[PDB]
Design a protein around this nucleic acid. Structure first.
Ligand code: MG
Ligand code: MG
Ligand code: MG
Ligand code: MG
Ligand code: MG
Ligand code: MG
Ligand code: MG
Ligand code: MG
Ligand code: MG
Ligand code: MG
Ligand code: MG
Ligand code: MG
Ligand code: MG
Ligand code: MG
Ligand code: MG
Ligand code: MG
Ligand code: MG
Ligand code: MG
Ligand code: MG
Ligand code: MG
Ligand code: MG
Ligand code: MG
Ligand code: MG
Ligand code: MG
Ligand code: MG
Ligand code: MG
Ligand code: MG
Ligand code: MG
Ligand code: MG
Ligand code: MG
Ligand code: MG
Ligand code: MG
Ligand code: MG
Ligand code: MG
Ligand code: ZN
Lengths: 49, 101, 116, 53, 154, 111, 144
RNA sequence: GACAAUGGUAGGAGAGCGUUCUAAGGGCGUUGAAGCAUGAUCGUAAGGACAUGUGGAGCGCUUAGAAGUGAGAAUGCCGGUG
RNA sequence: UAACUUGGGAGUCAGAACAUGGGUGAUAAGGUCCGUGUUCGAAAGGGAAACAGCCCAGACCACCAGCUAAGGUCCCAAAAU
RNA sequence: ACCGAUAGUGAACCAGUACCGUGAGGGAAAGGUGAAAAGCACCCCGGAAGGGGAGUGAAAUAGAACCUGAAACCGUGUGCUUACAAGUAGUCAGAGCCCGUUAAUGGGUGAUGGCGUGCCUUUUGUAGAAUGAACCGGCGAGUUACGAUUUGAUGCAAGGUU
């Protein structure tokens, strides 16, 4: 293989999903949190269990 | 002299030497096309198809196979963070009517 | 590494503003209100492509009605007679014929009346 | 009370239609030929009504 | 971040009554000169793979050279003093491409010093072989002793 | 042929200067001069000096006949604004814009 | 393929007609006249231009109503002053201004657009049997 | 070739556009880079070219890698100007 | 033409009108609480003047082609004076 | 595979300065002529400022916070258009007039007709007379570390791995 023709194994890599970057992504605005309540807050959500 | 021809799910009133634009035909530029559905012939002698005038034909020369001017299809629903933008260029065939019948 | 805001913002907004050419005052000048107007323009154009087909059929029907009445026949009965005669000329073509050569339209009218 | 909506460039300029000044009421001094205010002494030559001031 | 930026202790103005947006410190992130939200923070990017995979990678790079015919075996480098011009002539006579990886069995001072200044020529030992160097090179020039040592190791 | 003169950063607001420029735009030079002399506004002497400078270069630099010249162009562009304040009641201060004008006059023989 | 004819001022021909109100019912005469004024009787009807004809209505004073409209049909108007409602019965208006009666009946059947106002200006109504427009050489027109 | 599906908020899934940096390869540039400006250009979208003017020295492209990677709204912060 | 099992990720826990079976209220409420259906919510298009919740009907894109639904056909306003 | 002048130190610059506070203390803004200063002799209008020439320079349209010079905003000129009209300002249809392009079944304007109550947020439902934004620009929000779990990938496999 050549350094200008590198290729990762098929299916080994996937681009990370980025929230809060516009409505078309489907994760803009509320960024997948829905609306309000404890779980919509930075650091929100109850203890596991 | 004019004829009513059916093509591309539409109808066109044509005279000889007239340029027409129709839905894409399966032909090449410079070919000769024959329209075989003539509903009506007007002018000196009138012929009324029921629905088509039997044996009547309109010949034409294929000038161009093009794509219509770009349409930007855009819609949205206010307050819903919901919209869609798409482009469209409708294919067309341009021909010149050579002979009626 | 840091990615500064750069040029993309201006390029994108300028495109919307150019699409707003000819609008009134601030609507051809300010990105926010131009964007809004261009959104409205797209929605209106989508709607009106469909409304245009309705409007032109309406125009053809009106003109055919006038021609039929000149031959002592209503639009409705003329279309019914043409149907029973088996004539498939559509309203656009009927209107253009009635406008462009009246003798041909009179022959169509007689065919309709005979069928009725 | 305060403006409920800003004033468009168009509306502002319509309002300013009549906001302007006029050319002074002036005529040529019959003595020295320079322009003067009608019914005023001519400042160039000091003359008025064919006499010096 | 907002803790790190200088100053910013006090509340810039009272919570209510002034008509302004409520604010808690002049160094909040939306403020010009404020603290950065997240952003880079020093860290290592190094990671490991299993040893067997390391060895397989090295063998794969060497096999790629062998199959591309970019493998040349030389009896020895008999350099007594460093001479870049002589090493350049040796490369030209061996008909080597621009990018050459020279492999000795052990550290060869005169070969290293003669090749060091030639653009595109890298020198290594059998123990020092690595995937990046092999892959970057167009051709490998390996002494017979070095080749035998590599063969033993892998 | 045209001759130009500019007075930059005149400490008069452009709205005010343009009131007077609108009187002389497109008129003959002598009539314009008289209009400026007999118009009672702050910008009249400043504009007059610009006009006289423009006529002077028409004569000296381009050997134009000054008695046939017309004010072809006259306009004021915005210069940089001096920012000031006025103390108002209850400890507040309110802005004062001391605006400036770039005044351009262009005279022409029409040829 | 777009082929629809569009009338315009270069090719529009407006004729003059005379219609006799005598013995005719207000509304029925009015609807027919409105069609004429709008050009709905022309094969070249084109919505954005006035393709209609001029109409003179004579003997407006002899227009007729059915039922008890003479005393019971009331025309209201408002002066835009408080309490400024004024009313007049259809019979009284027929007696005192039959021309206005017909004009308002017809103009209420035309669109409230710039074009509709223009088209309504092509109507001329007279209470008696005479009109002053012989110069336009109008033709008699038979209703229905 | 056929014929079937394709409204959509929270939300799940997928494929992509564009930004800065790095690696390797291959290129462009004072016979004028980036930036900016204009145009009647191209793509299904994000967006991509080309020409001309301005500008005056840097910049694409391909594959892969990495992120301070995309703003219209926070009585947001700073500046400029109404 | 679905269904079920296991595992990864969720959101939701303010609902509305209309019709109908009922409680409550006064066989009051655009009231309130349950049952059942639809629609809105998250649905544009045609009708109901205008009119989320009614009636018809579910927009992949293009056409200056055709047939219909609810509703309509004297003029506004397409179609029967 | 850190920043590149709203970033990076608060401070690229005479900054813990200016400024604010009785005091502890708080705390800015502000970089760029040109290769070379060759930094515009001389003439002209002006009291000066400022300008027009001339000259220096590749360039002054690089002339002193002097590389580039976007937008808001302000002006001058003009092709089309507008003083009987009810406008979320567009959209679809469309004469007339003026042009002539990345040459494409072109560009600008728009008499007149149809249709049509911004955007965001929040809501059962908002043209909403509920919330937010004067405008433009820049800046401004799921990150990283270490653990867990699951899926994909790859190596080896009763072994795997340090
Ligand atoms: Mg993705
Ligand atoms: Mg969603
Ligand atoms: Mg948003
Ligand atoms: Mg989620
Ligand atoms: Mg929210
Ligand atoms: Mg809630
Ligand atoms: Mg929740
Ligand atoms: Mg950078
Ligand atoms: Mg930004
Ligand atoms: Mg306020
Ligand atoms: Mg900082
Ligand atoms: Mg005080
Ligand atoms: Mg969908
Ligand atoms: Mg569907
Ligand atoms: Mg997802
Ligand atoms: Mg960011
Ligand atoms: Mg209720
Ligand atoms: Mg309730
Ligand atoms: Mg229920
Ligand atoms: Mg609906
Ligand atoms: Mg409706
Ligand atoms: Mg039918
Ligand atoms: Mg009709
Ligand atoms: Mg800068
Ligand atoms: Mg700083
Ligand atoms: Mg600072
Ligand atoms: Mg500059
Ligand atoms: Mg008028
Ligand atoms: Mg909701
Ligand atoms: Mg409420
Ligand atoms: Mg209001
Ligand atoms: Mg609130
Ligand atoms: Mg507000
Ligand atoms: Mg802003
Ligand atoms: Zn005198």
């Amino acid at each position: 293989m050549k350094l200008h023709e590198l290729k990762p194994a098929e299916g080994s890599r996937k681009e990370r999903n980025r929230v809060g970057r516009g409505v078309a992504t489907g994760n803009g605005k509320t960024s997948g949190r829905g609306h309000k309540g404890q779980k919509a807050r930075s650091g929100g959500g109850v203890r596991p269990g | 002299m004019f004829a009513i021809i059916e093509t591309g799910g539409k109808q066109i009133k044509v005279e000889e030497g007239q340029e027409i634009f129709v839905e894409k035909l399966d032909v090449n530029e410079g070919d000769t096309f024959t329209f075989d559905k003539v509903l009506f012939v007007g002018g000196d002698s009138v012929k009324v198809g029921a629905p088509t005038v039997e044996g009547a034909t309109v010949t034409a020369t294929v000038n161009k196979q093009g794509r219509g001017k770009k349409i930007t299809v855009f819609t949205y629903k206010r307050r819903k963070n919901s919209k869609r933008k798409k482009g469209h260029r409708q294919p067309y065939t341009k021909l010149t009517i050579d002979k009626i019948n | 590494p840091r990615v500064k805001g750069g040029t993309v913002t201006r390029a994108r907004r300028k495109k919307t503003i150019k699409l707003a050419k000819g609008y009134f005052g601030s609507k051809h000048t300010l990105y926010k209100v131009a964007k809004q107007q261009v959104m409205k323009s797209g929605q209106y154009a989508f709607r009106d492509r469909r409304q245009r087909k309705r409007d032109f059929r309406k125009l053809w029907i009106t003109r055919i009605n006038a021609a039929a009445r000149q031959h002592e026949m209503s639009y409705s009965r003329l279309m019914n007679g043409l149907k029973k005669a088996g004539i498939d000329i559509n309203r656009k073509m009927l209107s253009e014929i009635a406008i462009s050569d009246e003798k041909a339209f009179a022959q169509l009218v007689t065919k309709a009346k005979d069928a009725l | 009370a305060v403006p409920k909506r800003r004033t468009s460039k168009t509306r502002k300029n319509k309002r300013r239609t009549h906001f302007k000044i006029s050319v002074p009421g002036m005529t040529e001094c019959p003595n020295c030929g320079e322009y003067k205010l009608s019914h005023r002494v001519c400042k160039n030559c000091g003359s008025y009504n064919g006499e010096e001031v | 971040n907002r803790s790190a930026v200088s100053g910013g202790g006090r509340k810039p103005w009272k919570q209510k009554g002034t008509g302004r947006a409520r604010q808690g410190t002049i160094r909040a992130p939306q403020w010009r000169g404020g603290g950065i939200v997240f952003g880079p923070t020093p860290r290592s990017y190094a990671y490991k793979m299993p040893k067997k995979m390391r060895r397989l990678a090295l063998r794969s790079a060497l096999s790629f050279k062998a199959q591309e015919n970019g493998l040349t075996v030389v009896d020895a480098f008999n350099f007594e003093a460093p001479k870049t011009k002589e090493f350049k002539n040796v490369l030209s006579t061996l008909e080597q491409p621009k990018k050459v990886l020279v492999v000795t069995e052990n550290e060869d001072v005169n070969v290293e010093l003669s090749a060091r200044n030639i653009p595109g020529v890298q020198v290594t030992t059998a123990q020092g072989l690595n995937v990046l160097d092999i892959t970057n090179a167009d051709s490998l020039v390996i002494t017979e002793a070095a080749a035998k040592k590599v063969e033993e190791v892998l | 042929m045209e001759a130009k003169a500019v007075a930059r950063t005149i400490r008069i607001a452009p709205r005010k200067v343009r009131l007077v420029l609108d009187l002389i735009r497109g008129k003959n030079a002598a009539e314009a001069i008289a209009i400026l002399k007999l118009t009672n506004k702050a910008s009249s002497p400043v504009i007059e000096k610009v006009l006289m400078s423009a006529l002077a270069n028409a004569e000296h630099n381009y050997d134009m006949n000054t008695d046939e010249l017309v004010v072809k162009e006259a306009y004021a562009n915005e210069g940089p604004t001096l920012k000031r304040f006025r103390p108002r009641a209850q400890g507040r201060a309110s802005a004062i814009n001391k605006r400036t004008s770039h005044i351009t006059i262009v005279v022409s023989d029409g040829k | 393929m777009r082929q629809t004819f569009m009338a315009n001022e270069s090719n529009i021909e407006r004729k003059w007609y005379v219609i006799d109100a005598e013995g005719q019912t207000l509304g029925r005469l009015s609807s027919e006249v409105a069609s004429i004024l709008r050009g709905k009787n022309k094969v070249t009807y084109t919505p954005h231009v006035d393709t209609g004809d001029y109409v003179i209505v004579i003997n407006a004073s002899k227009i007729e109503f059915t039922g008890n409209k003479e005393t019971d049909k009331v025309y209201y108007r408002h002066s835009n002053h408080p309490g400024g409602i004024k009313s007049i019965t259809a019979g009284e208006l027929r007696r005192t201004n039959p021309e206005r009666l017909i004009e308002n009946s017809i103009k209420g059947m035309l669109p409230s657009t710039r074009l509709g106002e223009k088209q309504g200006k092509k109507l001329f109504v007279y209470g008696g049997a005479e009109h002053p427009h012989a110069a336009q050489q109008p033709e008699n027109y038979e209703l229905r």
